[PDB]
Design a protein around this ligand. Sequence first.
Ligand code: CA
Length: 323
Amino acid sequence: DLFTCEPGAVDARTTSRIEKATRKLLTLCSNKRLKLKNSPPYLQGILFDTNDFFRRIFSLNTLDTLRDCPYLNLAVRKYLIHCRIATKLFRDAGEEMESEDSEYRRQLNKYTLVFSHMLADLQAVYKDGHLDADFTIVKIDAREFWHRQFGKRLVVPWSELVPIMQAELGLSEKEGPALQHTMDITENNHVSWFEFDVFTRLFQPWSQLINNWYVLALNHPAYKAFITYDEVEAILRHHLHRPGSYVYRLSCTRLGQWAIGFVTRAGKIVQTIPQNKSLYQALLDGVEERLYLYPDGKNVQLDLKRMISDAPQNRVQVTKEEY
Ligand SMILES: [Ca+2]
């Protein structure tokens, strides 16, 4: 496969290769013809920042120190490959790339989301440009799990993680691909400690981790995945006459945290990032405080506890073709 942790990608020419791939792509997405907006995820800024952050790592560490790092070799390979794919996407239908609604541009907006994740992942694993050898996964149960299964390893292949999550967390095989879509956000067939940290912060509490994921990310009408602040507002404007309408979303600038948009009792649209509170609990309290009543403006009342109680049986009835 293409994405591997073995040494060979980190050497004295790595930053040259990273810079050549980066400007090759910065020249492409520099058409003022392209209506590319600054709104995050901002592809040009990410590309600039990522090239800059690799240069920082190679200026702060000798090759002897970087050469054999499983994470850094993976991240270099993924970046160079992702630049290659994105560059080829620009080539194919150069004019159509101007078509804001084209399949080409929707693939591009998807590719810049991945770029954004890759940078946030690199900046966590190599915090301040040095290997954070004593990384701290935030949620205590996820931290103990990673330590007990993997010790101080930075990153593990998806295929090694899957049997452990089956045995310890009750994942079934058929759910694997859907799970990888949510957890392997850098899309490199591995899960770094930071991706695992992001996922376990999102779908806490640990004791219901997979069921929370199945309900909150696969079966809740309010979930809008990675959309922008403006997109949330555009949704909710349809529902100003319906106080308690709400959606929630993931934020590419705040991995591992949710944002919730709702219509207040006065008709205002409000977007918050719940402080120090899980999405599960934020939804429970918002129903109890009568803030979050109509998921996506729809006239259905969700008993979230009941949905999580019911999720083991419901997960059984979903077949392999439905995923
Ligand atoms: Ca990954």
